[PDB]
Amino acid sequence: GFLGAAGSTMGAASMTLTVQARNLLSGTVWGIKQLQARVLAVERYLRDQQLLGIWGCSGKLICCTNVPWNSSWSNRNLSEIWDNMTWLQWDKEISNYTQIIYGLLEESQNQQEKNEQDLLALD
Amino acid sequence: GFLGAAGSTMGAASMTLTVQARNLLSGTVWGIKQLQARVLAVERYLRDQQLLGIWGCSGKLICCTNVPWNSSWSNRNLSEIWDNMTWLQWDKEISNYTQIIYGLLEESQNQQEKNEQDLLALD
Amino acid sequence: GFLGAAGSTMGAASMTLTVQARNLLSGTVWGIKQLQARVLAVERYLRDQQLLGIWGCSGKLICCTNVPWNSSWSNRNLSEIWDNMTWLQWDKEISNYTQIIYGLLEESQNQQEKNEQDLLALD
Amino acid sequence: ENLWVTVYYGVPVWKEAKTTLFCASDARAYEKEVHNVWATHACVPTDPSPQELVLGNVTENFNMWKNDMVDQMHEDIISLWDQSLKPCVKLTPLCVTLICSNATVKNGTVEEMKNCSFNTTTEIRDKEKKEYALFYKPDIVPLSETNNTSEYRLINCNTSACTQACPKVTFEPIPIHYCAPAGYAILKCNDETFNGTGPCSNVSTVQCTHGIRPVVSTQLLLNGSLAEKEIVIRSENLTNNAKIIIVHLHTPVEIVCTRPNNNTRKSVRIGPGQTFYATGDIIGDIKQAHCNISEEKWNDTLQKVGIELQKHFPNKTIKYNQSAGGDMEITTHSFNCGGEFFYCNTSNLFNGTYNGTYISTNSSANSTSTITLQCRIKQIINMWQGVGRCMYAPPIAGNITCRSNITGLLLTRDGGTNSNETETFRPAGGDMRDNWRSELYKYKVVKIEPLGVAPTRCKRRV
Amino acid sequence: CNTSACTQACPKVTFEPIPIHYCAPAGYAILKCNDETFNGTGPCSNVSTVQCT
Amino acid sequence: VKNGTVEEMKNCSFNTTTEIRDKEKKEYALFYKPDIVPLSETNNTSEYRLIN
Ligand SMILES: *[C@@H]1O[C@H](CO)[C@@H](O[C@@H]2O[C@H](CO)[C@@H](O)[C@H](O)[C@H]2NC(C)=O)[C@H](O)[C@H]1NC(C)=O
Ligand SMILES: *[C@@H]1O[C@H](CO)[C@@H](O[C@@H]2O[C@H](CO)[C@@H](O)[C@H](O)[C@H]2NC(C)=O)[C@H](O)[C@H]1NC(C)=O
């Protein structure tokens, strides 16, 4: 199912993610707007892949990072997230702090890359 | 050569694969069909890269996996594959069991990712 | 800044590279040439990513390799590169030997991949 | 416990968004050279192999009146109709000092036709000859205010020019499907008690919509979908009488229209290499084209609609009356079938009342008591204004009949004051968006956002 | 003037049959048979990959 | 309009096709002198033409 994991818990929904990112081509051309859907879908996919790659996450959907989790973002227990809450509710509740997390991930990835380059080279 | 490895053995043909995947842009626009070739080529390339990436193979053409090889698929000796057989003949002989291999690779990659996430975290 | 690192030294300019590779969509369609900019930008981005990936560098902007640096290419000291020289001047001075470096990187990546495949398998 | 941020890709999270969908049709064969206006020329063949997967733990809000999908469908239909009228002939020299005579046809209750002779340009473009044709009275206007009963003119040539419809295209409303592009999804509400708004407890993700019939109608809905359990009433706001109230039936009502006249197709060389088709002569007697429905079933359907309406109006009686005046294109049920455009006076249908007493028609083995509506056939069509409205529909030889199913009604209330418990319902028409609004009310288009962030107890392996 | 209308050819265009080439798009290839005894069908023992015709 | 230093306009009457495309009526309009040219080289001060 394309959205078979929707409605389940976050832990249950964190499985078989590959079916969520296997969109293919469709339709026959009638005018320029038909091709605009294809090119904008390609641009969105490339944007998502580039955003995921600049954080040090390439080729893997699940990617654990080293940025600490601030308690002020959600301030809810672990049993309130992965046991009963759904992904849509969690996204609606956490969308207010996406930019800070993205900036922290970018800074952490750059810092880790620079530290790796410094430590590997000086030996 | 774009197809210089064609006609040789599988072992001989498993070299300089980079020349097989370096297609670039071409042509000047006359109508919408001229641009349709470009966008469909881009879509095919993205589809191939996404299919290769969901198996745990990103940025590498040769990618050894952990899925066991069933003897019923080919039931031929190793000397009958990498010594005299060509890639076209092998593809024509093995195209009947591509879906099973793809599904096994997807399941194995998901299982390995989940096991890695579980083992790294619990330490 | 999109080009905030321009004009500084190579060492100073080798920071916050992510802002240099975060181009997104823009414009509304008027004719086919408007869409041609989008598709050619996508093709150029895919070409750059493919060229970077065939050298063994996927998902990382900085990528140290094992190819030796020939002294005949620049024959200048390390203090003449990373201390005062800018990226534009360095590119204008080093553009005459890009093809040799690209070929060496491709050959080295293929050789390393084959050696890894041989050494991992025979154990 | 200490938590760390982790990014997940391929997450089923969606938000409302706007996008252009793709039209699709079944595997229809090309058959003859004649091809449909909106099939096998601007859409793609589809495959019903993917099914609607039901999400059993989601509560998604749905809206009907605030939806751009119907607007996009209307724009696409307008664009297709504009495109179809380009390659067909431009006519031009037809509107001249037509000389119309009573001819062999004599007085009668039928709408009748006028035999008009006029000068037409022959194959030589600097020479003229005499030709004649039969025209409908609504398509004929007196030339000047002066008293002259012999000189007439077409209704056109005071407005934008007219393009004759090609004879090699058909106006058959074949079903079509709407499919979302990549990265988008379509959610369908399977609940049968959907009143137009509010949450849906049974949602399903579907690849494409079902067959959508683009039938052109104003007062009634023909060849539409059927309700699951009972008649369902939809309206943006019952308090506002200016709005249009839709009633979706549960059981269809059979309707049979017919044109007993046996017309003859003529051919006149109007311009070089382009022909003009008109009615040459009528063979036999002159009769009235008419539509028939069954009186008992129509009365039962009206009573069902009345009891359904009485839920919102407990202390007010229901009354059905005629349309509130207007021009012929507004007050009459206008539709097209077989290639001919009919305008039927529906004043004899909506004549009744319901104050809360149920009446059942039992026995009546000889139930041939039917209700017949007279209709007027038009050739000049101005269905969509401001986009090349004028169109000439060529006539078709022989007598025709069209059997269809009424599946919905469109009504409008009227105001009142001082404890006026005699509110009445009248037929409604005009805007064409409402016709297709009742068919795509279940589908919502959403955009998938696969990037997500969650806390979990893990760290990068260094 | 008994059939469809006629359009005069422009005097500023020429009908010279200049040679043209056909090139496949990206992801496709063109195979040319170099055998001189090709009767229309059957296998080719001398095939060559070419960018354009 | 009479003589003056202004560029002035010419009042020209002509036959126009009415709503009937095989009938003509008389109409008139004011046109600028640069937009009006004599029809023919022959001497005629009453018959004129558009510059196009
Ligand atoms: C409609 O009018 C036209 C003439 O305006 C009729 O055509 C003429 O009919 C008479 C009677 O048969 C013939 O003698 C003439 O030769 C016809 N003239 C032409 C030019 O065809 C025509 O018959 C009338 N149609 C009807 C149904 O009365
Ligand atoms: C032209 O009219 C005749 C009769 O007036 C039609 O023949 C009838 O068609 C109906 C179709 O529903 C049948 O049920 C009847 O049995 C037919 N015969 C009679 C005597 O009514 C004929 O179909 C009409 N032309 C077209 C093209 O439909």
Numbering used by the authors:
A (entry chain B), C (entry chain F): 521 to 547, 569 to 664
B (entry chain L): 10 to 132
D (entry chain A): 32 to 132, 136 to 143, 149 to 150, 153 to 185, 185a, 185b, 186 to 309, 312 to 323, ...
E (entry chain K): 157 to 209
F (entry chain E): 139 to 143, 149 to 150, 153 to 185, 185a, 185b, 186 to 195
Recite the paper's sentences.
The HIV-1 Env is a trimer of gp120-gp41 heterodimers that are heavily shielded from the host immune systems by N-linked glycosylation and further protected from neutralization by conformational masking and considerable sequence variability. A glycosylated region near the base of the third variable loop (V3) of HIV-1 Env forms a supersite of vulnerability that is targeted by antibodies originating from diverse germline genes in multiple HIV-1 infected individuals. Here we used cryo-EM to visualize the interactions of a complete inferred DH270 clonal tree with the co-evolving virus Env.
We further determined the structure of DH270.UCA incorporating the VH G57R mutation in complex with the CH848 d949 SOSIP Env. The V1 loop in the UCA+G57R structure was displaced from its position observed in its free and UCA-bound forms where it interacted with and shielded the V3 GDIK motif. We next quantified these shifts in antibody orientation using vector-based angles between the antibody Fv and its gp120 epitope. The distance between the antibody and the epitope was reduced by ~0.5 Å in the UCA+G57R bound structure relative to the UCA-bound structure, with further minor reductions observed in I5 associated with the additional I5 mutations.
